[PDB]
Amino acid sequence: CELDRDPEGKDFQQPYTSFVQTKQNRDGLYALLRNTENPRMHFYQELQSDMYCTTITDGNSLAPFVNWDLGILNDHGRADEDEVSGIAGYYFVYNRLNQQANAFVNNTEAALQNQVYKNSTEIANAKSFLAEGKVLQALAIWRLMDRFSFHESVTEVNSGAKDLGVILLKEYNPGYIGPRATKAQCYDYILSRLSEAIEVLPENRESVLYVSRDYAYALRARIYLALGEYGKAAADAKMVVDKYPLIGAADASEFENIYRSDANNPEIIFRGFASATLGSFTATTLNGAAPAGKDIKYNPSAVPFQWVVDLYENEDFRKSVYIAKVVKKDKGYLVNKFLEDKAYRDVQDKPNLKVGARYFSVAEVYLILVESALQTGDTPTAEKYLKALSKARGAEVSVVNMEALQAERTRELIGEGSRLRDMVRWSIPNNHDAFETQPGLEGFANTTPLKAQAPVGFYAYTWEFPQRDRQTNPQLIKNWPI
């Protein structure tokens, strides 16, 4: 007498019994990765850097991040049913992706062990599906280790929170009460997942929308750079950098017309599916754009400094696409990288400012390889690839001298949330008061100093675990001493 009943009308979580169940759960995992790793979730690492100043129209929404107000950042965020945003929103979305990737990988392994697939093509595909899930496990753990764990240069911490990392779920467990793991176990687990996933995936890229082994090479290069091991980063970035071509343009208009488009852009390694009705969003925090009739109005809540514009040459293409002099009807500069896409609108005349999600590009691999070759000692490949990236955008670099690298990495990865981690690695302090705003835009900005001084080795570069955690969990050690 068996007496369990399956709910009619919905499926539930268990080891898989066919192949179409595996394929549909994999598509659901990719649609979850689309909303987890947005550009909307990475504006908080970008606004905390030494680039932005807050304008008057801000209602203290981005000002806790720019002015470093540590009283609000200790328990910032919200992850209720209504909205998911903030530090707790970041923690919530990457933990949700990690839990559902654990469920998918364990179910596909338990299905491959019990021989439920009927032919050889389903097995040869299910092994690749499992190898796709391991990369998403490693990515969702690396994001939490990047933003909720200390560097090796931090001076004062909580007593005992120097070595530890994030909590490491290996199985599906929404009621998990456990302690933090060390940084060695977490980084070994990440690189072990990527090592197991690289040897299984095919060499060619089957689709842009799904994980390829080029993405695994590029992600392992980024993690090896962020730890600091430069020779292994050059070993893992050289296998992918020559596969994808750079942009082709002669003037800024066709560079804008190609770069905003997702399908015609040739240098995208991995992006999410985006259509006019499914999978598009408005990333209008940095520029603050809005549709007005048939045009765009701009009311930005944070504008860059004058040193940010002064790194950019006037004949550059990124001067018209990445940042833009459109504030106050052409008087000021905002960040216009994530503005829109021409293909995702309903009526072709009026805009709606919808942009798809991109997870990697070849410019990150170029900068990784030039940096690792300059630190290792290989000057010619470093200068070759850096002059190639400079000639692709129309502004040739003069001399590679380990500062023009910082200039090009600043010019290319603006808006993507990489300035804070690079500021940590290069031992750069904040210096928010020593910089000046735009001379052409005065009064719309404000010279408000920092609430908390940020020298090198400061603990506030890495955030704090949320307040609902570590109150219900007595085995948790927080990061900040205050």
Add this chain to the structure above:
Amino acid sequence: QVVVLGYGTGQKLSTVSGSVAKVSSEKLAEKPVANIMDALQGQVAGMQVMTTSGDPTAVASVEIHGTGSLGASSAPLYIVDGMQTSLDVVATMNPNDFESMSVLKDASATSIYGARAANGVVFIQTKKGKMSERGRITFNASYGISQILNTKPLDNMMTGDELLDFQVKAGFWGNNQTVQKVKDMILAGAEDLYGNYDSLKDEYGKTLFPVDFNHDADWLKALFKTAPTSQGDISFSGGSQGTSYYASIGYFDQEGMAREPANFKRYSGRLNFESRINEWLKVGANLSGAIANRRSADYFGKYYMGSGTFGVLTMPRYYNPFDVNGDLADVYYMYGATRPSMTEPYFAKMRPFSSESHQANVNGFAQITPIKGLTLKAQAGVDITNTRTSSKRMPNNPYDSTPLGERRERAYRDVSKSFTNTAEYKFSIDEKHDLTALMGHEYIEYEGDVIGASSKGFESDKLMLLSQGKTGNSLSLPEHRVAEYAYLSFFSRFNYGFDKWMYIDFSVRNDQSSRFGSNNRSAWFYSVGGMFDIYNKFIQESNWLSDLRLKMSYGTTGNSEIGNYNHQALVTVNNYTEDAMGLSISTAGNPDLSWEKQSQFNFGLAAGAFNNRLSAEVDFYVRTTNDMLIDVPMPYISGFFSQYQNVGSMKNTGVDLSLKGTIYQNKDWNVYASANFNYNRQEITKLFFGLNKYMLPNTGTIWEIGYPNSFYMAEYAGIDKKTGKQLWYVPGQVDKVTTSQYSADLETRIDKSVTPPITGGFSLGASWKGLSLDADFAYIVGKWMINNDRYFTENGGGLMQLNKDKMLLNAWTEDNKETDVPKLGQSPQFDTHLLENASFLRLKNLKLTYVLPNSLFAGQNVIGGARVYLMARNLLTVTKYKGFDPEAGGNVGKNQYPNSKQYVAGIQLSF
């Protein structure tokens, strides 16, 4: 008496240790409503029952020994001579077939229905028919009327000529307007609305007047009526050598008192049969059926302008729904209306509804007695319900949005089945020792589904099939829902008795179920109990004491009224591209989902004096609930917003007592009385991850550790005589200080509990020469209720077009500065001044019967007797509530269906 508690044959009633309460067949029969539990308000001590609506299709809510859970249900287990039922299925059974009704409420009575008997169990037993030389026929017939309880909140409302003055002084009609300028033209211009429509273009001002100022209209007669009730039955009871039968056919029609329709009508039949085949076998079958047609008033509990009791209170008196002949018209008029508003019989005519339910119960047992004491019983049962409802919306009526019509059809099927196999053995070891041993197996299974299909766009009244709608855009997806569960169980029970004075019983049960999570699916429950007869051993005789028994027990039970599918991580649709679907997890489940385990300790004693003249029984219970269910809020490492796990603890401590007595005056007079009482106080022991207080979102209550769950609102301190604003108290800051500004930080825990602690009832009856008279009273004291209609009938600003209270005429102003009501430019909030004392004392029924004497039927061999009776239900109610009914609701009294008083008269020919 002999009570069958659980399984196996009955023991006794002075031997059981578990505090059961047996209700005989006098208190169940002759009742004029559909629910059978409502006739037990105030009879069984420690069981409170409240019917929260006056529908014919309403169902009472029963709670024995408090509310045992904050998170799951509280209703008991209702089983009917074997297999269990719902109250909607006992409502399709004739109550003249019930022989008894025993309520089992303490452990070592309930604890062999483990994982289902945390809330007690009601055990309804059906009649079996007496073995005699010739059988007997009994023919019952009744007729009654039903109407609304009290019309007290209409004594406070304004008239038309007062409401016009208050509205024009408040500035609702205009800035410089006045009466005889507002009265004459701006709203007696309802001829501009009554002129567009052809059916009433030529009839305005001749045979119907929508706006009338010379005298007010009666909205109670426009929204409530006096409704009949009929009932009849024929029953044949017979027997012979070994074989015994009881058959019955009956009919019961009851119509609701409101004008919006709600009827309950059934035709039912029963055949109980039991016959022994040979020396070692006996078979039997209980068969029943019904064809029941329900309909229920849906717009009660919601606020719509002109319906319910909200429409009696708030609709202004200068509007008139009648014509000049005193009958209800098709439409009435409100100001600013685009279309005229339909009255209640026209809206009942334009929106038909028809339900038909076919119900069958089949119950069968076979019993084998091979050896002198052994008894092997096997019992099977099926319970089948096929319902089929249909509701349409008629085309081409002029007072509507569109001339097109809609239709919807639904088919329901609920099939339940149950198997029970027991083996009993009883034997005496010595001349003074005795033992009984029972062990058995049970299997419960339920599956049910709903199918529905809808269509729209019809243009004719005759061409209203469902395959004649309009295609294209006027067609939608069907409805389809499926639920099911199953239970398996093995139980055992040992009854060891000494010679006369010591009895000890010990029981155990194992339950597995489809609802429990996949890591702990097997549940173990036990109980131990004992009764000591102190009169038969210690004090052998006395002059005033005739019986004295003591008993005590301890047991563990559980409550598996958790959902069918609440332990598993449901995946749903999350698409990636446009061609293929995706599935993603959306609830996270938990495999460790328990059965909400509770444990009860009980201690009591029962005495009887003056040779069983007076009788008393006192009971003390401590009932501790553990592992309750709450949809908890989760930490962020879950990746979800809820987990729905087992946390918390509660305890209910209480005392209940019951007295019965008999008084005399002669050899033919006979007076008797009874009175029972139950006090029950509860407290919440613990909660979630080390919390102390937790308020459930937008409910109105708070769960505080150390207190019962109370009301969580603002305090009210009245108005001030300086500026005349509302002043709420502050939680803390004693000096107490009041602030005029309202914020959500002014809320605190009120010291008034949600469930009423003190519950009781008392009966008194007399009998002279076959003419008897009985009267039963039922009281609930300590019950508070939020009166929601007083949000609308006495607010100063906002909702000004409605009828108000009379106490807004004494509003605070500069020349009138000593009152208790605020100014007119405000908006009242939900606070302490809406909590009202809903404690009541009802006279449940007054019944005067008369059996015709045996000398009148002497030569006639056909008719052997007769009975006549008059009965009045809900004759009086004393309370301090202001909302037409204190019983109809709980935590919130909305636009409610009041309970109704009824007068029935009946005959019964025992021919």
Add this chain to the structure above:
Amino acid sequence: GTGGSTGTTSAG
């Protein structure tokens, strides 16, 4: 009857 849902009611 229907027509306007006239509500600022509390939760049951």
